[PDB]
Amino acid sequence: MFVKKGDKVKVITGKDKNKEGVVLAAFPKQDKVIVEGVNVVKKHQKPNQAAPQGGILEVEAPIHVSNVMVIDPSNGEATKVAFKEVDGKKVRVSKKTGEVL
Amino acid sequence: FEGGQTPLFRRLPKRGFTNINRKDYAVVNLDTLNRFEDGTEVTPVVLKEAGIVKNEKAGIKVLADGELTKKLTVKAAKFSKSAQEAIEAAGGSIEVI
RNA sequence: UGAAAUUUUAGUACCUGUGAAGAUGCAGGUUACCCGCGACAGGACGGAAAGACCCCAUGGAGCUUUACUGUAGUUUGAUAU
RNA sequence: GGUGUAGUGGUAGGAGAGCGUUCUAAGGGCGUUGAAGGUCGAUCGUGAGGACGGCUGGAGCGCUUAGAAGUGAGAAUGCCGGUAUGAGUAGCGAAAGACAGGUGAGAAUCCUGUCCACCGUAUGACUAAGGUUUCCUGGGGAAGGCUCGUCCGCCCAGGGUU
RNA sequence: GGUAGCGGAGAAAUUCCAAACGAACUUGGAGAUAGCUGGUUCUCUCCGAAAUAGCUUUAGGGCUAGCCUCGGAAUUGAGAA
RNA sequence: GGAGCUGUAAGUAAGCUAUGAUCCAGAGAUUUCCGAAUGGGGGAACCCAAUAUCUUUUAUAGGAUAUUACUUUUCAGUGAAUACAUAGCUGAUUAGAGGUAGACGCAGAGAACUGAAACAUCUUAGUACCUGCAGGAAGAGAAAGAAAAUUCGAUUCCCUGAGUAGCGGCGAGCGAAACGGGAAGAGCCCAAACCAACAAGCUUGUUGGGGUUGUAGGACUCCGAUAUGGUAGUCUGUUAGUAUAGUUGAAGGAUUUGGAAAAUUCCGCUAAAGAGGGUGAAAGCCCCGUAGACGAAAUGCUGACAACACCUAGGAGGAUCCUGAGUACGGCGGAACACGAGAAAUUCCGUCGGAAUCCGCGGGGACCAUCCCGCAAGGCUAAAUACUCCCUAGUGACCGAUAGUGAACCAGUACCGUGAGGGAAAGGUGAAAAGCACCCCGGAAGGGGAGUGAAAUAGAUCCUGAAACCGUGUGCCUACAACAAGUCAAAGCUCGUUAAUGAGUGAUGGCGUGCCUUUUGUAGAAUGAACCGGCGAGUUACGAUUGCAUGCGAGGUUAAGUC
């Protein structure tokens, strides 16, 4: 997948449009991704998860990975991805510039 | 079916037979041949190439109903006598294949 | 606590007559405040069941026989082994 | 297109004109500023039927021409599903229970106890088959139990056959 | 344990053979056949019958004619009163 | 291949992973027990053994592994009546079993309902069913032919011939073939005469050589080539491709609405890519992908190319020999041929009888003669043809949850039945569980607030949410009235529209016996319907005929098949 854990990322669609953030986890079998600060839903929680009030948590729901646009780590302008065989090894590469990742 | 009443086919008699050696000839009635240029040679090959006769069943027979107006070296399997008269009178020539 | 058969819709009287010939429903006349409860069972040609009596079908099935046509077996002969 | 004359009851049935549904091809256009469908309207057309609005709804659908059909339902003792009717009616499936206490949100119905009644060549004790977990313990009362139920051969978690 | 349907068993009744046995049940041929009953869905307009003859192992079925409808055609306009 | 992975299936735990995981593909290993089940048995998924080695135990008992079914083929050893021997027995070997694909095709056996308006011949139908053999296809197949042309040259299949010729209680119905056109194309072996070798007992069994045919052929007698082409073969190899994993694969950002933009507007970009799908709504430019370009270590498959292997000869004579025997044929009885004994050729089965062989034999629809064509009684043979349990890629003027498979959901399930067997129902929250923390009533369920959410009258009976049916309230009317329950007129009362000779209700009066079916005729005491909703009946293929329309016109038109 063109998205991978440890990647600063821009969002394309949603109420959290134009926000940035990194990848906390990725679900390829759903083609979804989780992003800190984005889609922070308010979950009425029970205390069976070591939360001795039950309470109301705020946690990041997944996001569909097609609503996402990666960032150049050297430009800030968000881009699309190509795959290139550099040094024999296959890596992601920016469009709009040849920067890796 | 007439409701059990004796049907029309059953109350009537069978008649005749079929001759397996029957010769059924393809007919050309002498008004066609005003087509072809005088003096030429008419044949089953010519008639087929023109499209007049498509089925040379047993052979071409020529018959005289219409008026002939040409000299023609016609040839076929059989001619009728009136056709012979008309052709030979116009000035043609009968042959037989 | 909780069914069923039945059920075209129904604010479902009586006499006489009419009428697919025996009417809760049509007519004419009469009687009858509205809604129920318990009982009965005259009617709704009540329900149940495409009448088992009858007739029809060029229907079916079983059965009988000196009906027809055949046949398994039984018997006689010829021939082969 | 108009004027006149004459006609326009209708079954079986024949003929001709259509409305509507689904889909397709093309054209064109309408939809989160809310499509279809649903529902109410006192609307238009000779009829089949067609619009426009109000509320619902939440994503696909109309209009023109032509075409292809699983093309139109009120009956088939029709099929499937739903809900009525009878009707809160019959029935609640042979027999004796009463009381005090207790448990409990709640008790004719469960538990403990005392009297009482029933069986007793059995309504008792073994046991083959068959059933195949219904046995025991601890909880439960959603459903089942022809009532109820704190209870059960029901449900749930564990165990049990040497 | 044995007898199985063109059959078995029958102290024999047409009796029993897994809750209807004059020939079980099931599957297939099979959407059997049905001159028989029931049903057959939107509209308008034009016209509009018959229930008769003859024949029929035919009589509540069918065929032809008769009666209806539609299209064409021609003919000294025959048709009706 | 390159980072999340431990299925459905949440959730908890424990853990794995660039030391390259999960995942994907090829090959190999393990593969319990039943089942052909096969050591013996048995009520399948259980039991009990024999022999050899090894193991446990002080030793038994116990345990593991291997082998042990029957039948066929060959070989060997023993060996009865019975002497020789054979049978039999034992041991080694060899190849069969059984189910699939509810489909296709050869053979055996073989119905009836039905139609003939009854019915027996006949038809349905050599169908269904059963059984056997199978193969990817099978079967048929290289003329004892088709014809009448002196001519075509192996089978099969499509068109056509043709619904013709014929068959037929001359009824109902049945129904060809050849010619012609095409698809595909291929022809080969053997016995026999004779020759060489072996053997017993000059013939006669085995091996090899030879030789396969009809303008007759071969053996045999003479003349030279040692050739020349082909192959319907081989895990002989190589080579190339292809199937089974895959990789890459261009182009957009902002305004309005809105919860969300893919919609709207703005200017752009791209296209060997505007196929399709998904993405918070309808996206050419977000994603998967598409066009296009690359790629296989390993196992298969296909086709070529070399090696091996197998076939492959020519000209005269016919002195003599051979050229498929209980065979062809005939009689009787039956079948199949379109052909129902009929004038009945042809083919086949049973039975009985019973030929010649090159001056020979069979056919040309009884049969004889002439002519022509062919040479049986021995075998094989690809291709075009039929079918799909299945695999891959897909397509639809096919279905869209009473439809489409019986089954979109753990369906051949639950359930019914002793059993064979029959046989259901049941889909949709939301973009995302964010699925209602917390509070109150209550035993709980279930409600009410709060809160998430765009929306909760989207909260598990979850999108929409009709009707029947059950209710609540409210405007008008109703307790001297009989009424297929409406219609027409109409007072009074109450509301105010798709604003137009308005809506609702309705005292009271006049007229008026439901709908369907079937009937001479039904309000019907003749039939059907409890009601609502869904489903549910003149269609298609091939032909014929009539009309309408078009094209062409005494010429109008192709079928099959190829691209």
Ligand SMILES: [K+]
């Ligand atoms: K009564």
Ligand SMILES: [K+]
């Ligand atoms: K009888």
Ligand SMILES: [K+]
């Ligand atoms: K309908």
Ligand SMILES: [K+]
């Ligand atoms: K009869």
Ligand SMILES: [K+]
């Ligand atoms: K073959």
Ligand SMILES: [K+]
């Ligand atoms: K798209």
Ligand SMILES: [K+]
């Ligand atoms: K014959």
Ligand SMILES: [K+]
């Ligand atoms: K009235």
Ligand SMILES: [K+]
């Ligand atoms: K026509």
Ligand SMILES: [K+]
């Ligand atoms: K024409």
Ligand SMILES: [Mg+2]
């Ligand atoms: Mg008669």
Ligand SMILES: [Mg+2]
């Ligand atoms: Mg009477």
Ligand SMILES: [Mg+2]
């Ligand atoms: Mg009377």
Ligand SMILES: [Mg+2]
């Ligand atoms: Mg009246």
Ligand SMILES: [Mg+2]
């Ligand atoms: Mg009472």
Ligand SMILES: [Mg+2]
């Ligand atoms: Mg009755």
